[PDB]
Amino acid sequence: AEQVTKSVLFVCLGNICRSPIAEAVFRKLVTDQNISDNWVIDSGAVSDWNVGRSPDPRAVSCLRNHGINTAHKARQVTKEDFVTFDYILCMDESNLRDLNRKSNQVKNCRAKIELLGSYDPQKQLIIEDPYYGNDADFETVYQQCVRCCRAFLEKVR
Secondary structure: OOOOOEEEEEEEOOOOOHHHHHHHHHHHHHHHOOOHHHEEEEEEEOOOOOOOOOOOHHHHHHHHHOOOOOOOOOOEOOOOHHHHOOEEEEOOHHHHHHHHHHHOOOOOOOOEEEEHHHHOOOOOOOOOOOOOOOHHHHHHHHHHHHHHHHHHHHHHO
16 A cells, blocks of 8 residues: 655635635545545645634534534645645635735745636636625535545546
8 A cells, every 4th residue: 555645735715614624525535535644635824814713613513514524723824835735726716816926935836726616527616705604605615625626636646
């Protein structure tokens, strides 16, 4: 049982609603495929406003509904993220513009930065911020993340 070590960082604005859902979904996939040992996974925020906070309780109870757990604490994306992760997957175009901007301040940027939605077989590019929404909104984010994360994995696996 041997291979190489790959890494992915999921990113949203606050790292409280979207990215912790994507991250947790992704860990479950990889675990279910017996390849966890070959992956480093994390989630982070463009913004420093929520650092140290637990995920929104609605995200927590949505994942629980699907049998998944998280212990994540919000953290900000940093300069090193760009040189240590293979892939940076974000939720929306704002996040995307933001990361590209920051990566420029990075000389040896080695991460590929892309929208997670770009992997959606259904083509819903954007994973909308559900903060002001209700439980069904969270559920749709979960659904999108599942699709996108399985597709991403199949191609980089």
